[PDB]
Structure formats: structure tokens, C-alpha cells
């Protein structure tokens, strides 16, 4: 639909939480230009205020994505949390680029996969338990 999520490289799609993908699917043709206008001011914490100013319902849906992402960090070790924040940074940057029409470089996603592989078995299992929908 408006967002073109399917056009993303596979290794990038692998890391997307469900809530980001469901949000992207939901974007209507008149909603996308709202995200474009707002994200073009920057390079979501703070995006929410600006988006909601323009389109309350869209901003509500964006806030729900961020609320969703929080749960995924619960109970994780310092190393696993460091990893997860890098994963979400990758996903955020991508979705912003997709929205504004910048190219997508999947090198950051290949780095995430390599990094996951060198985590302890206990941290890999904890990440999978908190994110059963992600292909690490």
C-alpha cells in the first residue's frame, strides 16, 4: 500500500517488531504525507508530538508502537539490552527512510545478525523469548 514495506531487503524485514509492521501496513494514502512532512524535519519518542499535532489518530497509533517496543526490553541483561536498542535504532532509521524516500542500506542489518551470533547462549535465548516474532 502507501508504505511499500515489502520493498525492503529481506535481512532488514527479519528484525522488524510486529507492531512496526502493523503500523506501516495501516498507513493510508493520506497519512503517509503527514509522516513525510514531519520526518523530513529530522534525520519516535519526539516524533509523536509533532505527528499528533497534524493528525491525532496517526500519532496515537505511532505511540502504540513505542509502547509495544518497551515490553521487549524487560528483564534483559545489560548486553542484551544494548543489542536490542541497536536493533530498534536500525528499524526506526529504516522506517524513516522508507517514509521519506531515502535509500536503504542493509549493512546495519547484516551487522546485527553477526552481533547476535556472538552473544551468550543465555542472552540469545532471552532475546528470542522477548521477541518470538523476530528472526535474529
Tell me what the structure shows.
It is built from 8 helices and no strands. The protein starts with 9 loop residues before the first helix and ends in a 6-residue tail after the last helix. It is an all-alpha fold and 136 residues long. The relative contact order is 0.18. It is 65% helix and 0% strand. The protein has one domain (1-136): Four Helix Bundle (Hemerythrin (Met), subunit A). Keywords: Coiled coil, Lipid-binding, Secreted, Signal. The modification Cysteine sulfenic acid (-SOH) is found at residue 11. One of its GO terms (molecular function) is oleic acid binding. Belongs to the fatty-acid and retinol-binding protein (FARBP) family. It holds the Pfam family Gp-FAR-1.
* CATH-defined topology: Four Helix Bundle (Hemerythrin (Met), subunit A)
Number of extended strands = 0
Described by its quaternary structure, the protein is monomer
DSSP summary: helix tally: 8
Structural class: mainly alpha
What's the number of domains? 1
Intertermini distance: 26 Å
Element string (H = helix, E = strand)? HHHHHHHH
| 3D shape | globular
Q: Would you identify the CATH architecture? A: Up-down Bundle
Rg, please? 15 Å
Helix content: 55-70%
Instruction: Give the strand content.
Output: under 5%
Largest sheet: none
CATH class: Mainly Alpha
Amino acid at each position: 500500500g502507501a508504505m511499500s514495506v515489502a520493498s525492503l531487503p529481506e535481512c532488514v524485514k527479519n528484525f522488524f517488531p510486529t507492531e512496526q509492521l502493523e503500523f506501516s501496513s495501516s498507513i493510508t494514502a493520506d497519512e503517509k504525507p503527514v509522516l513525510h512532512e514531519v520526518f523530513q524535519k529530522h534525520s519516535c519518542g519526539e516524533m509523536i508530538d509533532e505527528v499528533s499535532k497534524k493528525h491525532p489518530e496517526l500519532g496515537k497509533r505511532l505511540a502504540t508502537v513505542l509502547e509495544g517496543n518497551k515490553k521487549r526490553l524487560d528483564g534483559l541483561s545489560p548486553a542484551a539490552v544494548e543489542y536490542a536498542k541497536k536493533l530498534i535504532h536500525m528499524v526506526t532509521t529504516t522506517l524513516c527512510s522508507l517514509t521519506v524516500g531515502k535509500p536503504i542500506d542493509d549493512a546495519d542489518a547484516k551487522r546485527l545478525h553477526q552481533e547476535f551470533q556472538s552473544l551468550s547462549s543465555e542472552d540469545q535465548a532471552a532475546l528470542r523469548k522477548n521477541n518470538p516474532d523476530i528472526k535474529f
